[PDB]
Amino acid sequence: SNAKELNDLEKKYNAHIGVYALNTKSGKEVKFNSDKRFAYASTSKAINSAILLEQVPYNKLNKKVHINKDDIVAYSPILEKYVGKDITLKELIEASMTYSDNTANNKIIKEIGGIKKVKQRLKELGDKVTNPVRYEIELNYYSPKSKKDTSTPAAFGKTLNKLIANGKLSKKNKNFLLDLMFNNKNGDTLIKDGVPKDYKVADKSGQAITYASRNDVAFVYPKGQSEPIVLVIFTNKDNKSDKPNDKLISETAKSVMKEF
């Protein structure tokens, strides 16, 4: 059974696994520690991007945003080149999703209206679990004794479905975002490495600083099926300093996909 496989994986990798998968066509679900809290780290870049794309039409993503020296936070491989320059909303979302640029995500949250506006949107979506508190990079300071910047697999996956796969995005904005997730430069070792050949994966990965917190969320499209399987995989380990093994997420994805 899938539960036995995931239990063996927890032991093989000495790690904790949280899984929620929903086949949006059939309604079938796979759940494993799906109500346990994990740090979501950069997987939240998918949420913040979608919220911004709900309120800015595609042809208005040319709006310019000025980048100052002090805006740059750690792991901003794109935005560190824009100090003293302007960047468009389109280029912020591209940097955030394609390269996991942290400054880009911060500017996107600001454009949305800040952390409080994100929380208001989550409540409207019926997500009373996902708990944004800090910006990059402090949101990656995960502690098991704290709920800051955590979610559960089930809550995060239901929110991904409601915002993107079955949300209210325009045709152009939805195709723009999903293509970024199909084509991103950070996900090849995770869900994409684990799914069988005839699936197409649009993912966003995450890694927090502590407790080997390693995540991937995705919309997984079976060949010939336009409705995705929403897949959320959160993992961590017991010690603060441990380093993640991406193969855990790949093998988890391979196991979960046997259910669909």
Experimental method of this PDB entry? X-ray
**Residue of 127, 199, 160 lying closest to 51 (CA atoms):** 160
Neighbouring-strand partners of residue 204: 217
Tokens of 247: 């193969």
Contact 254, 6 (CB under 8 A): no
Cα separation of the two ends of the chain: 13
> Where in the chain are the domains?
1-260
Annotated catalytic residue 42: yes
- Asked if residue 78 has a cis previous peptide bond (ω within 30° of 0), the answer is no
CA–CA separation, 34 vs 216, rounded Å?
A: 14
CA 100 – CA 191 distance, rounded (Å): 16
Contacts of 72 (CB under 8 A, 6+ apart): 79, 80, 83, 103
Residue 244 structure tokens: 């993640």
The domain at 1-260 falls in which architecture?
A: 3-Layer(aba) Sandwich (3.40)
Catalytic residue among 1, 26, 34, 42: 42
Q: For 199, list phi and psi in degrees, rounded to 5.
A: -120, 150
Q: Give the chain's count of helices (H) and strands (E).
A: 9, 9
24's CB contacts (< 8 A; 6+ apart) are 161, 165, 166, 227, 228, 229, 230
User: Tokens representing 100?
Assistant: 């996991």
CB atoms within 10 A of CB 186: 17
